[PDB]
Every structure is written in C-alpha cells, then in structure tokens.
Amino acid sequence: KVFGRCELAAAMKRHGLDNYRGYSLGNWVCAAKFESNFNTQATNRNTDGSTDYGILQINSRWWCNDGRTPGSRNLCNIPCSALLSSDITASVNCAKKIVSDGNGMNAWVAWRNRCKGTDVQAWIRGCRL
C-alpha cells in the first residue's frame, strides 16, 4: 500500500506514534517519506547484506527475521515480511522499540540527514487528525 500523507499521519496517530519518545507526528511522517515514499512494500538491500523493510525501512541485522542475514538478530520478534503489510501495526510496534534503543530517531539515518531540525510540522499541515 502507498499511503497518502495525511492518511499515514492519521494511521500513525491511531497507533500511538504521535509524540512517542517525544517525537512529534511530523517527524515520523518525514522519516517515512524519505525512507519508503510512504510505500509499505518498499525493500532495500544494504551493502552488508542485510535488507530494510516497509514504511520505516527496518533492518534485518537487528530487528526482524528474513532468513538470509547472517549473525543477525530479531529483536522485534517478527518476520521481516510483516513489515510490508498494508496494516502498519508491525512496523509501528517495531519502530517504538527502535526509537527507545538509546539514540532516538537518529537510528534512521534519513531522519537525521533530511528531517532532524527542519520544520517537520509541515508534514501534517492541513491534516484532519
């Protein structure tokens, strides 16, 4: 599924991401835009042979099992395919664990290099939330 902007903002809020660990909803929408372009089925292979999955491009080295990432963990206890679902629940619940890991949203390099410090509120501008 390819979410609309305000559609995703609403889904993220419904699933409790809005101000989660102090990150306003625009931060989460911004990160999703640059990670996946709001596409739940987005995948991207990393140089190190892990793969990133879903709207928040969650990596198989630590967070999900894909069966093909040596020496990896599965800290969210989910198959990485669950992160491709039209229903964003698995992604959101795993993002909550990631953002709690110590480095906040810096865990998403695209967030650090495209969203951090910007007027992220623009991402929810005009949305019925």
Side-chain angles (χ1 to χ4, degrees):
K1 175 171 172 179
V2 181
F3 277 80
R5 177 167 66 82
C6 294
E7 188 187 11
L8 184 58
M12 284 172 155
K13 183 161 191 154
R14 203 222 133 211
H15 289 80
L17 220 49
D18 156 43
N19 267 280
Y20 192 85
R21 291 264 168 155
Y23 293 94
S24 66
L25 191 59
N27 280 286
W28 295 102
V29 178
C30 185
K33 176 69 179 158
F34 295 132
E35 291 295 352
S36 67
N37 205 19
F38 303 151
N39 187 356
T40 69
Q41 306 193 67
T43 63
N44 288 288
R45 197 91 188 234
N46 303 133
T47 49
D48 78 353
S50 65
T51 304
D52 286 353
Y53 296 86
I55 56 172
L56 285 166
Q57 287 295 276
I58 293 180
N59 191 226
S60 59
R61 216 266 65 168
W62 292 97
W63 311 105
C64 63
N65 180 52
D66 71 6
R68 59 166 208 199
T69 306
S72 69
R73 311 281 290 283
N74 184 8
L75 301 173
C76 292
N77 301 291
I78 52 157
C80 295
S81 64
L83 299 171
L84 304 181
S85 180
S86 65
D87 184 312
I88 71 167
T89 300
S91 285
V92 167
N93 286 350
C94 187
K96 291 174 177 172
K97 191 168 335 263
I98 296 159
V99 74
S100 303
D101 191 70
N103 296 313
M105 286 194 74
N106 293 297
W108 291 273
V109 168
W111 180 87
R112 176 169 56 80
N113 299 329
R114 299 185 74 175
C115 303
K116 191 174 184 186
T118 74
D119 177 19
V120 297
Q121 178 264 119
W123 290 100
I124 62 189
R125 195 159 296 154
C127 308
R128 185 167 187 89
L129 288 173

